[PDB]
Amino acid sequence: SQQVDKIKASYPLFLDQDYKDMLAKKRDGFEEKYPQDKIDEVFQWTTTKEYQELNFQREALTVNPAKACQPLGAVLCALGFEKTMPYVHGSQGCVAYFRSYFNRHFREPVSCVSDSMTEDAAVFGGQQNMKDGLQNCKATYKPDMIAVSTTCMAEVIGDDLNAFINNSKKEGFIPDEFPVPFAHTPAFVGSHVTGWDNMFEGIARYFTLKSMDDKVVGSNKKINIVPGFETYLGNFRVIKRMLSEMGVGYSLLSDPEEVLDTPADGQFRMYAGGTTQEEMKDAPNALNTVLLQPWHLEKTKKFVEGTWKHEVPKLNIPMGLDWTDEFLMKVSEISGQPIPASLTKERGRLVDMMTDSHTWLHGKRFALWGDPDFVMGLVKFLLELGCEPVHILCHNGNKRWKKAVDAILAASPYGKNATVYIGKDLWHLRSLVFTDKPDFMIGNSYGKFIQRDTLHKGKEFEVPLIRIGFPIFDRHHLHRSTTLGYEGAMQILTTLVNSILERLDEETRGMQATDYNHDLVR
């Protein structure tokens, strides 16, 4: 039933008694459900160390992965270029998933197309799909560039992207001078960040490989910045802001910040902002190229060093205090600009916040996951705050990366109880937070189901989730946040300390039971 002036959605509608009785009648009659005592018994078993050992012996089964497939990253990379349409050669289903996936994180339109390869192309190739696709795309949506990647279908059958594009131009489906950079992005290799790497390097050589003769390193007096797979609008903006503050000329190569945040003013803008073709063409004339996320920009680095002859400096992701310092110092050396009074003061403001909040952060234990560069930056900053990053999980990490993070942990007393996991998923992590319970999780929205599982064991065993990463689907507009630089460090600190204090208030809210510690001042 419904009361017209207090309408109930699914929650709490189905808690009404008549629905509750109906649902119990459904279960007992036709579901042949295991008895509750058995369900309870098995759940308790899933929280044990015994279950964890069986869990970590998995070799073939993956449960609740913390990664996606390559072409998702190739799409995000292509969206960062002016009036550029991302184009995925292969099956259309993937493109619907890529758009939907990004729709829900940014709460914005995401433009991407397929050439809809089917059973017929599975035997003869997608050549005809490519020729009609490129022509249909250019005419209908009028991009200045089409950046081509592949679905795993196109990769398995072996479509030659370069030959197919060349034939499309030769046969007159698309103008010869119309730019169509491409990259192979096999889903069964690496993860979504590898797709970003592949796509970027593909675009960079398209505009520079054949034009190196007239290139002089440093002649344009700029620094190239390659951001990598980045889903926080504030992370694009803070980098550009700090460099403008320093008076450093720069080119942010791949910049989706505008197209992912267009105004609602009565008109839809498919394209907005982005790196210009001329910025890519001119990039080898930069003084150097800085890679913001080097651990998934390996292919890019080889091309920038091998072809542009830049000497890419060895910088960690600019996360936390030490690595933002090092980033700014290396930029000063390359550009010759001194670090200005405004960033020095911002740094001192971050330090002041650290000293103000260190008593509540000290010794706090965290489980966390995400992409490699993001994870190690988070690990570094936690150590700087006096926190203990107990469970460090990077599903798409590698042994080389794990070795570097272990060295970071070994250089601090707060990493003594920390372990780094690679190739493991969030079902692995679920066991860790039962057997070696931390205080909080830092991760994406998929972690909310780990919190639900811990609460079911008991309130005292609950591990609350702090949402930092990608994707975040169950909160609004956190994609505007910042995690890089002092600004991102200040935002992360505030989020962490206040999650701690919010949990303390909840545990001390019981009248006459625990509220002796329900302090007004913290």
Binding site: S1, Q2, I7, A9, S10, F14, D18, M22, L23, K25, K26, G29, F30, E31, E32, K33, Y34, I39, V42, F43, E59, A60, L61, T62, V63, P65, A68, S91, Q92, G93, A96, Y97, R99, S100, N103, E108, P109, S116, M117, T118, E119, A122, D132, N136, C137, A139, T140, C152, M153, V156, A187, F188, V189, T262, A264, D265, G266, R430, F449, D453
Partner: protein
Amino acid sequence: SREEVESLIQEVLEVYPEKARKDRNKHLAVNDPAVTQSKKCIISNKKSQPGLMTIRGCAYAGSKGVVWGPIKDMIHISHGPVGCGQYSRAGRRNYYIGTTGVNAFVTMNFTSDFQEKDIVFGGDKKLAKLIDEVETLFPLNKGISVQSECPIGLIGDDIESVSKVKGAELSKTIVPVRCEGFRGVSQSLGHHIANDAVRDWVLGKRDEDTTFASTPYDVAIIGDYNIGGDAWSSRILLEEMGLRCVAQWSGDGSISEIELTPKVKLNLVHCYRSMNYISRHMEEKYGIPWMEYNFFGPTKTIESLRAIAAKFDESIQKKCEEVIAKYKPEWEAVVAKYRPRLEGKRVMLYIGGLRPRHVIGAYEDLGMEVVGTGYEFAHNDDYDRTMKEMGDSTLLYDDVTGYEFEEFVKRIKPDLIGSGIKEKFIFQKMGIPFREMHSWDYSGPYHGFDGFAIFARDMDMTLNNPCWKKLQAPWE
């Protein structure tokens, strides 16, 4: 209108190249009450034109995401690389009651996570080892399904052999499903592939079981996936009417419910498109008749209840009127409050395979007018049913392109658009109120009398929201 509609279509298609031009013109039509057979009016269920930004998904979405994934006490393996399972994890609100990770698994993502080694050597060995690991870590699962992603068929794996062997070795129901995304032209073929998988591997399990205690009022809800609870708010009415809902396919469905469905007296089909296959098969083999019904809005719900009750005896028909009389004041209060706030406002729809026509009656129960609708993957039999429900001179678009939908909306200028997540934020920026008509925009249920109250609340909150008069800055 009419002539300005035909004129709008030709205008929009002037941007396409010659080939697309001609094909897209086949999928764009204006309704006409003097024509009854849609095969003479519009083409459907064809391949998408390359590079035009279709809204369609793939066959995998049609089988795993739509049909099989909701079955709660089974574990569904997304067999292939990591993408398909991750993008579809818990994105669809097929609600269920269970203890997730213990005896229910809908919102989890099980995957074989194809590496390049499995491409060159095949994944059948990995699948068999994967099935064993599932048995160790999730002992309370009541069956396993294997949802094939694009590479499986392309490399020559035989998942049916693995399913047969491991099934016997373990004495377990292991369903192979060949829903590779490159098969077919859309989610639609995934429906059909998945239906045949249920028939071939699950539905016959209890053909020789006689331990089920039947009643003359046993019935099954076919093709309702309990989006936000839609199926629960429908089951309540059917059992208030005196019926016993033996099974729910597949929203909040258990494998045992599936297995008992051949024992019912009547199959109630909500989603014809996704489930008419298994319905026809159950009529042929078990003699079970099936009928289409509609629980969107009070008008269609009342009519559905009466038609369903007419299939039984006078006692069910008396209870039918007791239910109609019970809820009458409730939905009358909903219309009395919300119909004044929505009447005369024009709606454009674009959804999947049923709702573009199925929700019309509810909008009209609120005084609204659907001036345009279309499907991603419906067949001509759906379009036959669509013309009987759509008004004269409506606009009809099959597998609409992103450009088409945009341009069509720019000229028609509806007061509300009901479509999917990939469309939502486009039209909000254009200043056009938008309601998600797949996910219900995380609200619902919308089925039944209890769903109509939420539906009316949701359309009113969005269409009349103060945000919409603020799109233009006062200074230009």
